[PDB]
């Protein structure tokens, strides 16, 4: 069976797009997002000439920050950004404009990304006994981005991703990680790159297919609501012999419709991963894309119109510190977790740090403790339930407890 997602209501798709539109005007290095550009170009929607300026800004920032003087003529210090994973997404952005990475600037960017994979391959080891410094998600993304531009990686690079899905790897990969690996493998297979691994790549695609389908929840999502978009992108790209893939994907469409109606998709990166699916496209369409299909011009959404809000109380707790932190914080209803953290700081006795990411603000330090290697600050709500959204998107209710927990992964 094939994974197919019948067309959704035009007004629902156009609402998703309206959430992206404010980002088309946010061109600072901190806010530029190649995933947003890719998702819009793969969608049935467009943002007009704003898209041209957005891609130009991407080219200015990614090339100036990573090459030569290595700072932005306009914006100054790039602060160690973009990352290599972000560079891979920039390469997808180029395919979304029917461009190949090229010239002496592009050739050097390609080798930087290849060095990233080589460095991760060395971190993992011929042994497979080490860990990537970033993640297997980024490792797969880097392989995908190169493959889309017809750039080869060595069998020994691909082996680390193969091993991670084969029967001897340790630990458990999320649906999102498995999906991105599957997308990388699919590009290699379609391109007949790495024929010295022809069969292991074929087997790996099937394995990912099976593991994603086994992760389908009763509500129909693959893993969770925010894993379903990339899971569907992977599943749409190959048939699955002897399985009920078609009904599995229809069950996911139901779950997505419910989640969409419930307001689940407001994060720009998450929207950017979902819009291709709702246009029957995936990142694998960037091998030979049709970049000039008609797309509907988006219009601005109604202006917010802020209203009267009651005060609420949220308990913020950090038990990963000695002495522990626990305080009741009052904020306006509809405030985000980040707003709670700002108030806690303003009251005294609390501090934290964030860094920018394509998903928004990422919490990196709490009360002077910065997360170290393979650690992170996990966000949870009562009872012992990890959030599915970040500090700038989760809006807690009165009486809720938000916990920040130091976790090793």
């Amino acid at each position, epitope marked *: 069976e094939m994974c197919e997602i019948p067309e959704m209501d035009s007004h629902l798709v156009e609402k998703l797009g309206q959430h992206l539109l404010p980002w088309m005007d946010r061109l600072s290095l901190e806010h530029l997002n190649p995933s947003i550009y890719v998702g819009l170009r793969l969608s049935s929607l467009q943002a007009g000439t704003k898209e041209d300026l957005y891609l130009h800004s991407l080219k200015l920032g990614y090339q100036q920050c990573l090459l030569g003087s290595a700072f932005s003529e306009d914006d100054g210090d790039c602060q160690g950004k973009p990352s290599m994973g972000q560079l891979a997404l920039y390469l997808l952005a180029l395919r979304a404009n029917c461009e190949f990475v090229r010239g002496h600037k592009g050739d050097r960017l390609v080798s930087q990304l290849k060095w990233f994979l080589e460095d991760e391959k060395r971190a993992i080891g*011929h042994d497979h006994k080490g860990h990537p410094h970033t993640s297997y998600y980024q490792y797969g993304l880097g392989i995908l981005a190169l493959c889309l531009h017809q750039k080869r990686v060595h069998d020994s690079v691909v*082996d680390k991703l193969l091993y991670a899905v084969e029967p*001897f790897h340790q630990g458990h990969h999320s649906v999102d990680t498995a999906a991105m690996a599957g997308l990388a493998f699919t590009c290699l297979k379609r391109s007949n790159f790495n024929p010295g691994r022809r069969q*292991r790549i074929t*087997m790996a695609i099937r*394995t990912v297919r099976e593991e994603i389908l086994k992760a389908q929840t009763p509500e129909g999502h693959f893993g969770n609501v925010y894993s379903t978009p990339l899971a569907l992108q992977f599943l749409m790209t190959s048939p699955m012999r002897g399985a009920e893939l078609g009904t599995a994907c229809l069950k996911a469409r139901v779950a997505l419709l419910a989640s969409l109606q419930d307001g689940a998709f407001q994060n720009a990166l998450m929207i950017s991963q979902l819009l291709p699916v709702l246009n029957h496209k995936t990142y694998i369409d960037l091998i030979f894309p049709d970049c000039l299909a008609p797309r509907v011009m988006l219009e601005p959404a109604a202006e917010t119109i802020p209203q009267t809000q009651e005060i609420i109380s949220v308990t913020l707790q950090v038990l990963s510190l000695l002495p522990p932190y626990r305080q009741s914080i009052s904020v306006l209803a509809g405030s985000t977790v980040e707003d709670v953290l700002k108030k806690a700081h303003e009251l005294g006795g609390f501090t934290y740090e964030t860094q920018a990411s394509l998903s928004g603000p990422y919490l990196t330090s709490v009360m002077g403790k910065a997360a170290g290697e393979r650690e992170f600050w996990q966000l949870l709500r009562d009872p012992n339930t990890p959030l599915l959204q970040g500090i700038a998107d989760y809006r807690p209710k009165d009486g809720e407890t938000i916990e920040l927990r130091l976790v090793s992964w």
Partner: nanobody
């Protein structure tokens, strides 16, 4: 840790090899027992379908070795009966490729585990 069960035996003796896989996808793979004899190249000895329904043996070994698996424990077994000197080798567990007449992935791997040494000598 992965491969175990090897040793030194008389001709006609028996051994049971175990291969414990740490990974969640074990059930998604055909598995094979491979061997590298002193001075020789990689050879698939026996392979088994994902479920256990179909098997595949090198001619040298049919009637004497039996491959089995336990997906509940993530383990592949090789029962080696009536051992011959020519069976002397290091034995390795790895994936295999189900086929209609299973098949070796000897040429698609460049990393093998430690394996387990088998020696049959008068």
């Amino acid at each position: 840790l992965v491969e175990s069960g090897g040793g030194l035996v008389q001709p006609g003796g028996s051994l049971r090899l175990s291969c414990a896989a740490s990974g969640s996808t074990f059930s998604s793979y055909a598995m094979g027992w491979y061997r590298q004899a002193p001075g020789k190249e990689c050879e698939l000895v026996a392979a088994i379908s994902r479920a256990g329904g179909s098997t595949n043996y090198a001619d040298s070994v049919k009637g004497r070795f039996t491959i089995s698996r336990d997906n509940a424990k993530n383990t592949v077994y090789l029962q080696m009966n009536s051992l011959k000197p020519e069976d002397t080798a290091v034995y390795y567990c790895n994936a295999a490729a189900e086929g209609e007449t299973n098949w070796s992935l000897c040429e698609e791997y460049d990393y093998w585990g430690k394996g387990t040494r088998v020696t049959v000598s008068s």
